[model samples]
Target: MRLGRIASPDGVAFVSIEGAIAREIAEHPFGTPTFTGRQWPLADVRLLAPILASKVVAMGKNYAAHAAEMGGDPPESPVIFIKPNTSIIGPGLPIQLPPSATEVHHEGELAIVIGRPCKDVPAARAAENILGYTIGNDVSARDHQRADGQWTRAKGHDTFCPLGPWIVTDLDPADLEIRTEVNGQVRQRSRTSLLLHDVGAIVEWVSAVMTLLPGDVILTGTPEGVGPIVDGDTVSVTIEGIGTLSNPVVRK
Candidate 1:
């Protein structure tokens, strides 16, 4: 149950961590996020991006070695896409890179956090409209996704979605073990049992096309060494039980 969203000094809210303490959760963690006895010390708080979603639905090539290393093949069905929760950013923030991006890549992934108000769901109830798992970082701009062949400006710009270092309730996202580092090496490992289309069929193919409210966000893809990330790179994204989402790569 590691839910999160912090800031401390009594500002932001929603938290629940435990090892080092973080308590406080009086606003939203969707269904059962109460605990406002107020606490802190998780290094005095500051983590964020545990859920500001309203649409970040992603999933492309659900890993087939990242679709034969991006040459194409694994998309016979679920191929959703749409990052633009204002291009979120959370753990340590800073994935800026604008100037039309010079390359920008880093697609570590495994994020889904909608906890109610889904629509048309039915991948067998999709664990009751989920509300867990985290760690995304689908930042992209590979030449605006190869000269804007589409991908909404290479996956919607802004900070290019970094997602949390939080959220992870009840677990069981299939196999698990996703990876992807940079500036410290390890490009993009895999597992989620190689997802070809998992996470309850990507929430039954994205709630059959719409209504997925309650802090929605669903990326669950990315495997294969997605390259590039300039301007002082850092890019982390772990996901083996969900927990490491480092970030820092300026370039404004």
Candidate 2:
């Protein structure tokens, strides 16, 4: 099932999207959703981020090619980082580039949407806590990344993390294709099979350090071919089985 959030006449609600129709689901989607009997043509509803993530945990250089692309061997354990909640924006939204940002890069990645609370979860049981998979774009500024010494300032900027189209549930996340493009030109392309640590391992390691709550998200990592985008450009991330997430670029 594909789940999404939208603003309806009654107010904001989560909806189960099918074919060309969307039906309101009661309350949140962390549990089995009960229908609220409201329906609309999918195009008639205003789409929002599938989930309002409490926090977004992301891995860096999970693909060996991406590590090599940065002139380094893949680390024994890929480093993890956090993108602030305020950084999130949905499909068709604008990715605002800070005036001081000389170059803003696009990292197309596959992200997991947590379905349950988990701490110190074993790799074998990671699937039990995952709601589904979605697409994520981890946008970062190269100058701030180099100048700040720490990545928080560079990675935590608002409108930097773009997630959605929608969430796909009950699907195997392994070996899916991930492609990124900027203004119709391919920038990054690779399959999830290239990830050094798979979804199970990522969930296990992250939960060991931080508890993942329902609606929280973890972006697995990006592949090689990452590059910068400029104002008026539209960047897109497409993951097989999940939908595409595209955002336009604008200067602040």
Candidate 3:
């Protein structure tokens, strides 16, 4: 099932997307399946980030090619970092380029959405805690990241993490195609199979360090070919099985 969050007449509600239609779900789909009879044309409702996470844990250079591009070798373990909750924006929203940032780059990646709270999870059992997968664009400011020696300021800018288009439930995350395009041109292309630390391993390692609550997101890192985007540019992150999450860029 493809789960989504959409703006409704009453307020924001959970939904199940089927083809061109969206059926409102009675409650959060994390546990049991429950759907309201109400339906809407998929185009009629505004889609929001599938989950409102307290914090977003992300991996750095989880792809060997990306590591090489960044002048490093793939780590023996996942290099985890956090992206502030305020950085998140949903599909069709604008990714505001901070004036202080001389270069803002797009890092398209596959995002793991947690289904339940879990800590100290083993790699073999990590999949049990996952709700599903979604697409993410890990937008970064190159200058801040290169100069600060820490990632918080560079990765936590508002509107920097673009996620959504919805979440795909119960799909095998291995070997899926992930791609990024800016202003209609391909910028990055690789498969999830290329990830040095796959989703299960990432969850296992991260859960050991912090409790992953329901609705929290874990970005599985990007592939090679990350590049800068400018004002008025449109960037899209697409993962196979999950849908495309496209956001426009604008000056802040």
Candidate 4:
């Protein structure tokens, strides 16, 4: 099922995207979201980030080519970081380029949405706690990243993470194609099978260090072809099963 949150006439609601239509649900899908017998033309409602995550845990250099491009080697274990909830925006939203950002870039990756609260989960059982998957653009300010010698400011700016188009509840994440586009040109392309650390292992490693709550997200790192985006550029992140998440670039 393709689930999403939308801004409808009544208010924000959870819905299931069925092709060109959205069927409203009575509650959050994580806890048995049920249909309310209402429907809307998908174009009539605004798409919002599928979930309101308290925190977004993301991996770095999880793709071998991406690590080499960044002048680093893949870490022995998952190298994770946190992006505050404020950084998230959904499809059709703007990815504002803050005045301080000189070379903002796009890093497209697959995002995992947590379905349940858990800690110390084993890799074998990690999938059981996952609600579904979505697409994510891990926008970064390269200059700030290198200058700070860390990723907080560079990766945590407002509107930096654009996720959605909707979440796919049942799809094999392995071997899925992930692609990134700037304007109309393709910039990145790879398969999930190329990930240095797979989803289950990454989730297990992160849960070992922190408690994961429902609605929280985990961004499996981007593939190679990472590059910059400037004002007026439109960036799209597309994962095989989840569909496309496109956002415009604007100057703050």
Candidate 5:
């Protein structure tokens, strides 16, 4: 089932897609329907990132091409980083660029949302912790990124993490296509098969260090061809079976 959060003329509510014209209101098990209305058109409501995650843990250099782009090798293990929850923004929201960032870049990735709290999960049991999959754009300030020698300031800015439009619970992560486009031009294009460490492995590796809570986001990292996003540019991240997340870039 595809799930999402939207803002209607009434208010923000979660909804489930049943068919072309029938959307069931999403609620806790055995709960009441939140709304009574005609089949709501998707166009009528504004889209929000499907999950409200507490922390967004991301991988770096997961793709050899992307790793090579930075003059490095695919890691012996997953290289992890964290983006604060404040950076979260729903699809179609603007990615406000901080004044210190003169060169911001887009990193398209398949994001996994944790469904349960887990630590030291085995690779074979990792799937049990996943809630679903969604598209994520890791918007970075390249200048600050290279200067800081650490990713905190460059990655954890407001509006730096753009996610959603839709969340898919049943995608075969083994072989999925993920791409990024800047203002209609394709910048990064690759498949999930190219990941140095697969999602299951990443989950096991990450959980070993810290407990992953429900709704925690794990970014599988980006592909090659990383580039810059200037003011007024629109960057879109798409993952097969999930959905596209597009956000406009603007000065803060």
Candidate 6:
């Protein structure tokens, strides 16, 4: 199942895609079925961040190659960070680059969507709390990230996080190819098998400290080849089984 939020002449609603149909689930602006008598191509529909998570916990440098790419030593434990909810947007949206940012980068990653609440979970039981998986692009302001000594300002800018065309529930997290292209040029590429700590371990560790709630997102980090973005450039994050999440960059 792939779930998304869309708006049309009829209204804005949460639509669930099951095979061929995109059905209405929530009422937002208009009041008719969005797909009625319409050929709904992805390009014509507006996509919003699927959910406003109470918390967004992300893993940093989960790939050894990525750590080496940035010329940093791999850490013994997951490098966790919080991305403000204000930073989230969805596919087909635009990421506004702040005036303070001179250099910003894209981190193409596989993010897990939690379906159930969990705390102090064990690795073996972690999957029970996962709702599904989706693609996430953790857009960062490199200058802020490097200069601040902490990630708050760099990773917490509005529109810094681009997630979902839709949530996919059937995909396996262990063996998917993740890739990123900036204006049609491949910049980051790798597979989930390269993650230093797998999904189960990440969930267990994260849950032990904080509750993973329904609709919460956990980004598992990016691979080597992470780099920058510019105005009018489009960044696409693709996870083979999960759908693609793309956004354009524009000067705020």
Give the whole-model CA lDDT for all candidates, comma-separated.
Answer: 0.83, 0.89, 0.89, 0.90, 0.82, 0.81
In model 6, the runs with Cα more than 4 Å from the true position are: 26-44, 66-75
| Tens-digit per-residue lDDT, 13-88, candidate 4 | 8899997999988876786678889999998999999988989999996876543443455447788999999999
Please, what are the lDDT tens digits per residue for candidate 1 over residues 139-194?
Answer: 88888778878887888988899888888888988888888888888998888866
Model 3: per-residue lDDT, tens digit, 71-182?
A: 4554586788999999999999999999899999999999999999999999899888999999988899999999998988999999999989999987899889899999
Model 5: colliding residue pairs: none
TM-score of decoy 4:
0.94
RMSD of each: 14.7, 2.8, 2.9, 3.0, 3.7, 5.0
For candidate 1, the lDDT comes to: 0.83
lDDT of 5 by residue, 157-248 (tens): 99999989766766778878888999899998998878888899899999999999888999998988889998899999888877688999
Model 6 gets an lDDT of 0.81
Clashes of each: 0, 0, 0, 0, 0, 4
What does candidate 2's lDDT look like per residue over 1-252, in tens digits?
899888776688788989898899876577788897999888788888899889999998688564344355545785899999999998998999998889889999999999998899999999999999999999999899999978888888999999998999977988888999999999999888778888999999999999899999999999889899899999999999987899999996
Off by over 4 Å in 3: 66-75
lDDT of 4 at 199: 92
Over 4 Å off, model 5: 19-26, 29-39, 66-75
User: Among all windows of ten consecutive residues in candidate 2, which has the lowest summed lDDT?
Assistant: 66-75
Off by over 4 Å in 2: 66-75
